[PDB]
């Protein structure tokens, strides 16, 4: 089997991407944030505290003939940005882009933090990291990908995120028309439950490539590119007037700037992030200070190849017995 679904930015900045997902019988379509940095499929639901719902589409298990309470199971998750959610668990039929999993754990939110409430466009998350990170207790549950894997034509999914445009998540096949050149594969460590890999270096604009190992995670659920302070300083030093602002929470730059590109290494291959991808616009409405899309990972504890990086590539998440990651230009 295979699946193919379009993923669409939630706003003009590509802050996140939503992908329609069918849950239950008859289908209830919710728009979920596919997150390769976590491993829970959770949804706004008929159980979510009413004051914490503001415009989201909810899953109502009582209206699904295939929903079953997973008795005694609870979940609770906290994300890197400080947001969180928790609740109980159903199993139900879940389909993405024509690919169906029966008995998928669908984590129903009883509580969500303010950041989720405030984002009316995101009806929940669909985790695509390794199932070892799943938070369901006392019986840990598998991700949609892990459940689908055996049925897939090939044990892979791909992320093809757009810059200010829709893109695609495919399951079970590699669309050879979706990228240019060849795909370069690189080793993954699953020790922390992430799609963790080591970039071979970077360049800023037309500058020389610096060969240096940068361990980080491929994380579709993180907006920006978070790299070591040395690398980030080298980037922003090439932008007149750029500075790190503790009051704003990172590097800012004059909105009048033209940003240089940023290149990262994948083995001997190179992925180029155009400068425009690094512009996250005014820090507040009407400001002439703009927020940067490359930020320091210092104090996160891990480097994160988030959407800013991933949307510059066609990315293969290879879930074979020995997982690997592939990157191609596009």
Swiss-Prot record:
Catalytic residue list: 35, 199
Enzyme class: hydrolase
Peptidase A1 domain location: 17-328
Disulfide-bond pairs as recorded: 255-290
GO MF annotations in UniProt: aspartic-type endopeptidase activity
Record-level GO BP terms: proteolysis
EC number(s) reported in the record: 3.4.23.22
Protein name (Swiss-Prot/TrEMBL): Endothiapepsin
Native organism: Cryphonectria parasitica (Chestnut blight fungus)
């Amino acid at each position: 089997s295979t699946g193919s679904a379009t993923t669409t930015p939630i706003d003009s900045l590509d802050d996140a991407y939503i992908t329609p997902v069918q849950i239950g019988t008859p289908a209830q379509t919710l728009n979920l944030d596919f997150d390769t940095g976590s491993s829970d499929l959770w949804v706004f639901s008929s159980e979510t505290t009413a004051s914490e719902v503001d415009g989201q589409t909810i899953y109502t298990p009582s209206k699904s003939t295939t929903a079953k309470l997973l008795s005694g199971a609870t979940w609770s998750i906290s994300y890197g940005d400080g947001s969180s959610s928790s609740g109980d668990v159903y199993t139900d039929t879940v389909s993405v882009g024509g690919l169906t999993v029966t008995g998928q754990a669908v984590e129903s939110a009883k509580k969500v933090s303010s950041s989720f409430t405030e984002d009316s466009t995101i009806d929940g998350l669909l985790g695509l990291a390794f199932s070892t990170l799943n938070t369901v207790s006392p019986t840990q549950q598998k991700t949609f990908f892990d459940n689908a894997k055996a049925s897939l034509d090939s044990p892979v999914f791909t992320a093809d995120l757009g810059y200010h445009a829709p893109g695609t998540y495919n399951f079970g096949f590699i669309d050879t028309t979706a990228y240019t050149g060849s795909i370069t594969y690189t080793a993954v460590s699953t020790k922390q439950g992430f799609w963790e890999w080591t970039s071979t270096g970077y360049a800023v604009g037309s500058g020389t490539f610096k060969s240096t190992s940068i361990d980080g995670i491929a994380d579709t659920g993180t907006t920006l590119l978070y790299l070591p302070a040395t690398v980030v300083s080298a980037y922003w030093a090439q932008v007149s007037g750029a500075k790190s602002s503790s009051s704003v929470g990172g590097y800012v730059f004059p909105c009048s700037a033209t940003l240089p590109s940023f290149t990262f290494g994948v083995g001997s291959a190179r992925i180029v992030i155009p400068g425009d991808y690094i512009d996250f616009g005014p820090i507040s409405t009407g400001s002439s200070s703009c927020f940067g899309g490359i930020q320091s990972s210092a104090g996160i504890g891990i480097n994160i190849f988030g959407d800013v990086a991933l949307k510059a590539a066609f990315v293969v998440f290879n879930g074979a017995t020995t997982p690997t990651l592939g990157f191609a230009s596009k």
